[PDB]
């Protein structure tokens, strides 16, 4: 047959460059440098990339480039039995678009939000601000700084929502921005990687250039090397701990993108003799090398703060949301020019997150048109019914109370049930299809074939590297809070839903076909696991 | 170490059949992709047909397509030519050749056996 | 198919002196495809260089390879009478695979 190809090589590289780079190489890698003895967390984290993460980013690249179709049919085409895995996996990547974009329309607001000379969460006189403003972060609940109150009383109204049962009223200028996100996926996505691989281009350079502005800002900024410090002072006292490597691990395998089915979509409208091997290794190094440097424009700036401000560094050294929603831009508001380095902020940040969201939703796209025409052929009507579908019940994430439904979301929708589909799907590659047929598979690709240090990632390490994770996940469990809030029991039980709703699909799938596939047990599972091409 | 006997082969009829086999030894034989090489008597090489390390991928010379079939025993360790409808171009000797990487040649020949087709 | 011209045809050289020969593609080939075979009068072929440049095991460093795209070479700094042979260049790049026509190298007295 014929599938589409990219129009070049480098719509496919910034492509998987754009999805691997987003906000958590910005606000949670410097964190836990910072948190984890500086410069020695590198090794835990440079091995669990080099045993885990690495190896897992390089099987699905390769595997979606062999076998050229999306999610649901190629782990169909693979091990038939373990169909479910590309379902599960699909609506992982559903759940997800459900609250992921709501930061980009953050971003966007903020931006907006600074067409001015004078930003406005600099100060503590305004009608959203409450007698214990601060002006720059403390280290006491109930005293908040100027940053913190206009992002939770202003540009959230979270004040007004006594939990996810009281999400409150509609915020139309937040929802408008979320349309504008939509909006911007839609019609980079319509028309496929034809327009999308062209896109990428603006959206993971962009990036690149406002991460160098920044870079220069924050280090000739007076107390930028007692940030650096701060990042990057070593202390092997960690390394002995087990949370770190915890964090680590954690960390790598989030970071990369391996086992949601985009890479496998992206990969699959290659050449089958590219050299994926080479995009991996260049792919990966690009995004954890992002996140080492934009260590360096958070914590310059960071020191300037603790320096020159009068802040205590574990104030401000913090992570997720609030170190780019809050503290970064604090100090831009001190800045000379300050109005500039906010604009590029935030549209770097907007940036960050939409070539995320374009392969999340890339793969939930791809991996339907390979399995039903009638939206192949339909492909600009499925994108409106789809981005309509996550926009209207993503005015829910506009209302008052919509942390309360985003943080629900963040901790349910992919998070135990990707480590749980991605632990088959090295079992199924490397156990039931075997890793003589994937290096076999790659030889014909590439000309040679896989290491033995990557088969034996392949086959040992990346199970028990997803397992190590899946474990400690489970010991450090405590129920869903967010500051004084403790969400209901039912709540709670909600997102087991979701987080089973997707796995579920693995063991299901499994009988359903277990129960339609004729002959005897072993008869019936030797038809279900030798793959399409045999 | 390394070891490649090529077997079989002699005089066919035109339209005959014959079945060549190369005895490996030496080496994991199920980890290499093989290939028939041959040299005619004005002694040049010609590449014949490929087999993947597990004999999923296959590929023929636009000469050979149709007549010549490749095939693979992991298990004794055995690698076939199997010849039919012979014409007097395919007299050469044929070689066994192990190729697995593509960026490495064939590393790794037999001595050959000699095939010659004449009525 | 990729045709594999390789030139001088034979070639007689004094031992000691410098040799070098050809192989010229009608399709450009990856540098990293192209190998080169040495094979005795009645012996079977043993590979002497891949990648264009790298020597086999158990080849003198009087041998060297180079070229790109469609123009290769072979060279032996000083020649030893144990380098009478026949030369034959291979691509690996794109089936057919295809072999060159080769470069028989012949002693001078």
């Known amino acids: 047959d014929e599938r589409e190809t990219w129009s070049g090589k480098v719509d496919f590289l910034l492509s998987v460059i754009g999805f691997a780079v987003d906000l958590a190489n910005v606000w949670r890698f410097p964190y836990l440098c910072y948190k984890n003895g500086g410069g020695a967390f590198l090794v835990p984290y440079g091995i669990m990339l080099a045993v885990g993460g690495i190896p897992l980013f390089y099987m699905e690249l390769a595997l979606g480039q062999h076998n050229r179709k999306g999610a649901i049919t190629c782990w169909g085409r693979l091990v038939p039995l373990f169909k479910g895995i590309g379902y599960a996996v699909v609506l992982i990547a559903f759940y997800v678009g459900f609250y992921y974009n709501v930061i980009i329309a953050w971003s966007l607001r903020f931006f907006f939000a600074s067409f001015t000379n004078s930003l406005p969460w600099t100060s503590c006189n305004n009608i959203w601000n409450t007698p214990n403003c601060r002006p720059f972060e403390g280290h006491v609940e109930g005293f908040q700084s100027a940053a913190s109150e206009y992002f939770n009383r202003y540009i959230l109204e979270l004040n007004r929502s006594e939990g996810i049962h009281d999400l409150g009223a509609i915020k139309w200028d937040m929802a408008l921005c979320l349309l504008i996100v939509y909006l911007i996926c839609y019609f980079s996505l319509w028309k496929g990687i034809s327009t999308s691989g062209k896109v990428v281009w603006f959206t993971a350079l962009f990036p690149y250039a406002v991460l160098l502005i920044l870079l220069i800002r924050g280090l000739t900024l007076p107390g930028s090397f007692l940030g650096i410090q701060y990042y990057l002072t070593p202390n092997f006292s960690a390394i002995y701990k087990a949370e770190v490597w915890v964090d680590a691990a954690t960390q790598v395998f989030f970071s990369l993108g391996p086992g949601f089915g985009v890479l496998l979509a992206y990969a699959s409208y290659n050449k089958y003799h590219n050299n994926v091997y080479k995009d991996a290794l260049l792919t990966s190094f690009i995004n954890s090398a992002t996140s080492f440097i934009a260590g360096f424009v958070i914590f310059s700036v960071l020191g300037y703060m603790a320096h020159t401000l009068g802040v205590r560094i574990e104030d401000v050294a913090t992570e997720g949301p609030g170190l780019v929603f809050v503290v970064y831009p604090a100090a831009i508001a001190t800045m000379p020019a300050s109005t500039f380095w906010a604009l590029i902020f935030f549209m770097m940040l907007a940036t960050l997150g939409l070539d995320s969201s374009f392969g999340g939703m890339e793969a939930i796209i791809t991996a339907l048109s390979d399995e039903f025409p009638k939206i192949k052929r339909n492909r600009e009507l499925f994108v409106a019914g789809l981005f309509s579908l996550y926009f209207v019940v993503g005015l829910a994430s506009c209302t008052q109370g919509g942390f309360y439904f985003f943080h629900l979301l963040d901790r349910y929708a992919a998070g135990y049930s990707i480590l749980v589909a991605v632990f088959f799907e090295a079992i199924a590659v490397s156990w039931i299809y075997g890793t003589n047929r994937f290096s076999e598979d790659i030889r014909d690709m590439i000309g040679f074939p896989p290491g033995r240090y990557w088969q034996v990632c392949w086959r040992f390490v990346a199970p028990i590297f997803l397992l190590f994770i899946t474990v400690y996940g489970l010991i450090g469990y405590e129920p869903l809070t967010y500051a004084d809030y403790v969400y209901p029991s039912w709540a709670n039980a909600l997102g087991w839903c979701i987080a089973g709703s997707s796995v579920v699909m693995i063991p299901a799938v499994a009988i359903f076909k277990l129960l339609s596939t004729p002959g005897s047990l072993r008869q019936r599972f030797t038809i279900l696991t030798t793959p399409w091409r045999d | 170490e390394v070891q490649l006997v090529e077997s079989g082969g002699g005089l066919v009829k035109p339209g005959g059949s014959l079945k060549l086999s190369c005895a490996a030894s030496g080496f994991t034989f199920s980890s290499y992709a093989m290939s028939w090489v041959r040299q005619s008597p004005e002694k040049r090489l010609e590449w014949v047909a490929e087999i993947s390390s597990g004999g999923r991928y296959i590929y023929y010379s636009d000469t050979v397509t149709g007549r010549f079939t490749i095939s693979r025993d992991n298990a004794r360790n055995i690698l076939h030519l199997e010849m039919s409808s012979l014409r007097s171009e395919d007299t050469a000797m044929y070689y066994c050749?192990?190729?697995?990487?593509?960026?490495?040649?064939?590393?790794?020949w037999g001595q050959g056996t000699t095939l010659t087709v004449s009525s | 198919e990729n045709v594999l011209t390789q030139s001088p045809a034979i070639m007689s050289t004094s031992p000691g002196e410098k040799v070098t020969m050809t192989c010229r593609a009608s399709?450009?080939?990856?540098?990293?495809?192209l190998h080169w075979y040495q094979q005795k009068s009645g012996a079977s072929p043993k590979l002497w260089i891949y990648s264009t440049s790298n020597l086999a095991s158990g080849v003198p460093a009087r041998f060297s390879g180079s070229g790109s795209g469609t123009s290769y070479s072979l060279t032996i700094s000083s020649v030893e009478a144990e380098d009478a042979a026949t030369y034959y260049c291979?691509?690996?790049?794109?089936?057919?695979?295809?072999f060159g026509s080769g470069t028989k190298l012949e002693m001078k007295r």
């Open positions: 291979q691509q690996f790049s794109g089936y057919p695979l295809t």
């Open positions: 399709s450009s080939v990856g540098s990293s495809y």
């Open positions: 050749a192990r190729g697995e990487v593509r960026q490495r040649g064939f590393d790794y």
